[PDB]
Amino acid sequence: KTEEGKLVIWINGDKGYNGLAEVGKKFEKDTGIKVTVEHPDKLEEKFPQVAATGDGPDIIFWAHDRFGGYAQSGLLAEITPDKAFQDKLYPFTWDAVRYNGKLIAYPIAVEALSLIYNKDLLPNPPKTWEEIPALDKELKAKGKSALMFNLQEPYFTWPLIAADGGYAFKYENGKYDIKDVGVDNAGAKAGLTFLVDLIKNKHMNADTDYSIAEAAFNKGETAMTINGPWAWSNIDTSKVNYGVTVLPTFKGQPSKPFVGVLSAGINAASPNKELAKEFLENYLLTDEGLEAVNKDKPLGAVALKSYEEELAKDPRIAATMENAQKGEIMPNIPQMSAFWYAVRTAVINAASGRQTVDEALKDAQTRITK
């Protein structure tokens, strides 16, 4: 016999409340287990109020750094390495979230971007981007193309010119700098200059929207189809043959992507530390657990070694594991917060037609320093 058994799950995106409800109705069925499903809006202020107590439970679903990156420096239920024995999970999954020597991050949704291809009229990747032009001239020779996507989209131009030569820091064998910026370099310039000229060197107008620029590839099927926050799941599909491949390098190496794992859990495991972990292990990350979300509201898959055997059938994880195989974890870097304002005035203005990167770059070199 339990007591109260009440929990508050904060989620908001599209669905999930319907699936989580089924799990609660079954729990309370015993005689005292009801869960609440609400969307976050004022929790930002209630957090510091509920952190000490407030009510009782508290579990919100957020990105890796959003929760695991923030909670790590606040008050997260740092679990101990015990279940890892009977669980026999993978070290790469744990090492990915190893801060100091505790567990302040629980991933329960691996989502990432990738490139789609075919085995009929879609030539495979030659090697690097330099070859991309050869596929277009060849495709058009008949009645197709090898490039169709947005241009002024976020999290697209940044990662491209980010891992092209330089911008924030230099990566050497997987090592980032601290007080050493590399924005004032030929690499960072050659990149922004390439992605920018592509616009003025095309229609010098820029009349392609998100739904338009995206409709290009979605209009039929070209050598360029990337999935994102729009339609990851659709019950089922049929295109004869379809697969996923990793992005091609550029001037040495491709953009700088990362894994999209959702960090969910209790804060400091204050409210029921036992039931909290047990409820998450025996009512969230299990055959019956995910059975609700994986069926009710699908989107991705977990990183279970056992389930991975059958989960491999799905491309969702197959695409993430590709880049995640070698390494892909979004860092913290708080300086990025301020850069968000510079990246706009730098790109946006430069895209106006009466602005050059030399200004946003050179002028920034003086501001960034002093």
Coordinates of all heavy atoms in Angstrom, one line a residue, residues 246-288:
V246 N 25.1 10.2 -43.3 CA 25.7 11.3 -42.6 C 26.1 12.4 -43.6 O 26.4 12.2 -44.7 CB 26.9 10.9 -41.8 CG1 28.0 10.4 -42.8 CG2 27.4 12.0 -40.9
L247 N 26.0 13.7 -43.0 CA 26.4 14.8 -43.8 C 27.8 14.8 -44.3 O 28.7 14.2 -43.7 CB 26.2 16.1 -43.0 CG 24.7 16.5 -42.7 CD1 24.6 17.2 -41.3 CD2 24.1 17.4 -43.8
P248 N 28.1 15.3 -45.6 CA 29.4 15.3 -46.2 C 30.3 16.4 -45.6 O 29.8 17.4 -45.1 CB 29.1 15.5 -47.6 CG 27.9 16.4 -47.6 CD 27.1 16.0 -46.4
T249 N 31.6 16.1 -45.6 CA 32.6 17.0 -45.1 C 32.6 18.3 -45.9 O 31.8 18.5 -46.9 CB 34.0 16.4 -45.1 OG1 34.4 16.2 -46.4 CG2 34.1 15.1 -44.4
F250 N 33.4 19.3 -45.5 CA 33.5 20.6 -46.2 C 34.8 21.3 -45.8 O 35.0 21.7 -44.7 CB 32.3 21.5 -45.8 CG 32.1 22.6 -46.8 CD1 31.0 22.7 -47.6 CD2 33.1 23.6 -46.8 CE1 30.8 23.7 -48.4 CE2 32.9 24.7 -47.7 CZ 31.7 24.8 -48.5
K251 N 35.7 21.4 -46.8 CA 37.0 22.0 -46.6 C 37.8 21.3 -45.6 O 38.7 21.9 -45.0 CB 36.8 23.5 -46.3 CG 36.7 24.4 -47.5 CD 36.5 25.9 -47.1 CE 37.4 26.8 -47.9 NZ 38.7 27.2 -47.3
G252 N 37.5 20.1 -45.3 CA 38.2 19.3 -44.3 C 37.2 18.5 -43.4 O 37.5 17.3 -43.1
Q253 N 36.2 19.2 -42.9 CA 35.2 18.5 -42.0 C 33.8 19.1 -42.2 O 33.7 20.3 -42.5 CB 35.7 18.6 -40.6 CG 36.6 17.4 -40.1 CD 37.7 17.9 -39.3 OE1 38.9 17.4 -39.5 NE2 37.5 18.8 -38.4
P254 N 32.8 18.3 -41.9 CA 31.4 18.8 -42.0 C 31.0 19.8 -40.9 O 31.8 20.1 -40.1 CB 30.6 17.5 -42.0 CG 31.4 16.6 -41.2 CD 32.8 16.9 -41.5
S255 N 29.7 20.2 -40.9 CA 29.3 21.1 -39.8 C 29.5 20.5 -38.4 O 30.2 19.5 -38.3 CB 27.8 21.3 -40.0 OG 27.2 20.4 -40.9
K256 N 29.0 21.1 -37.4 CA 29.1 20.7 -36.0 C 27.8 20.3 -35.4 O 27.2 21.1 -34.7 CB 29.8 21.7 -35.2 CG 30.7 21.2 -34.1 CD 31.6 22.2 -33.5 CE 31.0 22.7 -32.2 NZ 31.5 22.1 -31.0
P257 N 27.2 19.1 -35.7 CA 25.9 18.7 -35.2 C 26.1 18.2 -33.7 O 27.1 18.4 -33.1 CB 25.6 17.6 -36.1 CG 26.9 17.0 -36.5 CD 27.8 18.1 -36.6
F258 N 25.0 17.6 -33.3 CA 25.0 17.0 -31.9 C 23.7 16.2 -31.7 O 22.8 16.3 -32.4 CB 25.0 18.2 -30.9 CG 23.9 19.2 -31.1 CD1 22.7 19.0 -30.5 CD2 24.1 20.3 -31.8 CE1 21.7 19.9 -30.7 CE2 23.1 21.3 -32.0 CZ 21.9 21.0 -31.4
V259 N 23.8 15.3 -30.6 CA 22.7 14.5 -30.3 C 21.5 15.2 -29.6 O 21.8 16.2 -28.9 CB 23.1 13.3 -29.4 CG1 24.1 12.4 -30.1 CG2 23.7 13.8 -28.1
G260 N 20.3 14.8 -29.9 CA 19.2 15.5 -29.3 C 18.4 14.6 -28.3 O 17.3 14.1 -28.6
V261 N 19.0 14.5 -27.1 CA 18.4 13.7 -26.1 C 17.6 14.5 -25.1 O 18.1 15.6 -24.7 CB 19.5 12.9 -25.3 CG1 20.1 11.8 -26.2 CG2 20.6 13.8 -24.8
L262 N 16.4 14.1 -24.7 CA 15.6 14.8 -23.8 C 15.9 14.5 -22.3 O 15.9 13.3 -22.0 CB 14.1 14.6 -24.1 CG 13.5 13.5 -23.3 CD1 13.1 13.9 -21.9 CD2 12.2 13.0 -24.0
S263 N 16.3 15.5 -21.5 CA 16.6 15.2 -20.1 C 15.4 15.4 -19.3 O 14.9 16.5 -19.1 CB 17.7 16.2 -19.7 OG 17.9 16.2 -18.3
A264 N 15.0 14.3 -18.7 CA 13.8 14.3 -17.8 C 14.1 13.6 -16.5 O 14.7 12.6 -16.4 CB 12.6 13.7 -18.5
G265 N 13.6 14.2 -15.4 CA 13.8 13.6 -14.1 C 13.4 14.5 -12.9 O 12.8 15.5 -13.1
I266 N 13.7 14.0 -11.7 CA 13.3 14.8 -10.5 C 14.4 15.8 -10.2 O 15.6 15.6 -10.6 CB 13.0 13.9 -9.3 CG1 12.1 12.8 -9.7 CG2 12.4 14.7 -8.2 CD1 10.8 13.2 -10.2
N267 N 14.1 16.8 -9.4 CA 15.0 17.8 -9.0 C 15.6 17.6 -7.6 O 14.8 17.7 -6.6 CB 14.4 19.2 -9.0 CG 14.5 19.9 -10.4 OD1 13.5 20.1 -11.1 ND2 15.8 20.1 -10.8
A268 N 16.8 17.1 -7.5 CA 17.4 16.8 -6.2 C 16.8 15.6 -5.5 O 17.1 15.3 -4.4 CB 17.4 18.0 -5.3
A269 N 16.0 14.9 -6.3 CA 15.3 13.7 -5.8 C 14.7 13.9 -4.4 O 14.7 13.0 -3.5 CB 16.3 12.5 -5.7
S270 N 14.4 15.2 -4.1 CA 13.8 15.6 -2.8 C 12.5 14.8 -2.5 O 12.4 14.1 -1.6 CB 13.6 17.1 -2.7 OG 14.4 17.6 -1.7
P271 N 11.5 15.1 -3.4 CA 10.2 14.5 -3.2 C 10.2 13.0 -3.6 O 10.1 12.6 -4.8 CB 9.3 15.3 -4.2 CG 10.2 15.8 -5.2 CD 11.5 16.0 -4.5
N272 N 10.3 12.1 -2.6 CA 10.3 10.7 -2.9 C 11.5 10.3 -3.8 O 11.3 10.2 -5.0 CB 9.0 10.2 -3.5 CG 8.0 9.8 -2.5 OD1 8.3 9.7 -1.3 ND2 6.7 9.6 -2.9
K273 N 12.6 10.1 -3.2 CA 13.8 9.7 -4.0 C 13.7 8.2 -4.4 O 14.3 7.9 -5.5 CB 15.1 9.9 -3.1 CG 15.0 9.1 -1.8 CD 16.4 8.5 -1.5 CE 16.3 7.1 -0.9 NZ 16.1 6.1 -1.9
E274 N 13.0 7.4 -3.6 CA 12.9 6.0 -4.0 C 11.9 5.8 -5.1 O 12.1 5.2 -6.1 CB 12.5 5.2 -2.7 CG 12.9 3.7 -2.8 CD 12.1 2.9 -1.8 OE1 12.1 3.3 -0.6 OE2 11.6 1.8 -2.2
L275 N 10.6 6.3 -4.8 CA 9.6 6.1 -5.8 C 9.9 6.9 -7.1 O 9.5 6.5 -8.1 CB 8.3 6.7 -5.2 CG 7.5 5.7 -4.3 CD1 7.9 5.8 -2.9 CD2 6.0 6.0 -4.4
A276 N 10.6 7.9 -6.9 CA 11.0 8.7 -8.1 C 11.8 7.9 -9.1 O 11.4 7.8 -10.3 CB 11.9 9.9 -7.7
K277 N 12.9 7.3 -8.7 CA 13.7 6.4 -9.5 C 13.0 5.2 -9.9 O 13.0 4.8 -11.1 CB 15.0 6.1 -8.8 CG 15.9 7.3 -8.5 CD 16.6 7.1 -7.1 CE 16.9 8.4 -6.4 NZ 18.3 8.9 -6.6
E278 N 12.3 4.6 -9.0 CA 11.6 3.3 -9.2 C 10.4 3.6 -10.2 O 10.2 2.8 -11.1 CB 11.0 2.8 -7.9 CG 11.8 1.7 -7.3 CD 11.8 1.7 -5.8 OE1 10.8 2.3 -5.2 OE2 12.7 1.2 -5.2
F279 N 9.7 4.7 -10.0 CA 8.6 5.1 -10.9 C 9.1 5.4 -12.3 O 8.4 5.1 -13.3 CB 7.9 6.3 -10.4 CG 6.7 6.7 -11.2 CD1 5.5 6.2 -11.0 CD2 6.9 7.6 -12.2 CE1 4.4 6.6 -11.7 CE2 5.8 8.0 -13.0 CZ 4.5 7.5 -12.8
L280 N 10.4 5.9 -12.4 CA 10.9 6.2 -13.7 C 11.5 4.9 -14.4 O 11.6 4.9 -15.6 CB 12.0 7.2 -13.6 CG 12.1 8.3 -14.7 CD1 11.3 9.5 -14.3 CD2 13.5 8.7 -15.0
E281 N 11.9 3.9 -13.6 CA 12.5 2.7 -14.1 C 11.4 1.6 -14.3 O 11.5 0.8 -15.2 CB 13.5 2.2 -13.1 CG 14.9 2.8 -13.4 CD 16.0 1.8 -13.1 OE1 15.9 1.0 -12.3 OE2 17.1 2.0 -13.8
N282 N 10.4 1.7 -13.4 CA 9.3 0.7 -13.5 C 8.0 1.4 -14.0 O 6.9 0.9 -13.7 CB 9.0 0.0 -12.2 CG 9.9 -1.2 -12.0 OD1 9.4 -2.3 -12.1 ND2 11.2 -1.0 -11.7
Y283 N 8.1 2.4 -14.8 CA 7.0 3.2 -15.3 C 7.4 4.3 -16.2 O 6.9 5.4 -16.1 CB 6.1 3.7 -14.1 CG 4.9 2.8 -13.9 CD1 4.7 2.2 -12.6 CD2 3.9 2.7 -14.8 CE1 3.6 1.4 -12.4 CE2 2.8 1.9 -14.6 CZ 2.6 1.3 -13.3 OH 1.5 0.5 -13.1
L284 N 8.3 4.0 -17.1 CA 8.8 5.0 -18.1 C 9.8 4.4 -19.0 O 9.6 4.5 -20.3 CB 9.4 6.2 -17.3 CG 8.8 7.5 -17.5 CD1 9.5 8.6 -16.8 CD2 8.6 7.9 -19.0
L285 N 10.8 3.8 -18.5 CA 11.8 3.2 -19.3 C 11.7 1.6 -19.3 O 12.6 1.0 -18.8 CB 13.2 3.6 -18.9 CG 13.8 4.9 -19.6 CD1 13.8 4.7 -21.1 CD2 12.9 6.1 -19.2
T286 N 10.6 1.1 -19.8 CA 10.4 -0.3 -19.8 C 9.5 -0.7 -21.0 O 9.0 0.1 -21.7 CB 9.7 -0.8 -18.5 OG1 9.2 -2.1 -18.6 CG2 8.6 0.1 -18.0
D287 N 9.4 -2.0 -21.2 CA 8.6 -2.5 -22.3 C 7.2 -1.9 -22.3 O 6.7 -1.5 -23.3 CB 8.5 -4.1 -22.2 CG 8.0 -4.6 -20.8 OD1 8.8 -4.2 -19.8 OD2 7.0 -5.2 -20.7
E288 N 6.5 -1.9 -21.1 CA 5.2 -1.4 -20.9 C 5.2 0.1 -20.9 O 4.3 0.8 -21.4 CB 4.5 -1.9 -19.7 CG 4.6 -3.5 -19.5 CD 4.1 -4.0 -18.2 OE1 2.9 -3.6 -17.9 OE2 4.7 -4.8 -17.5

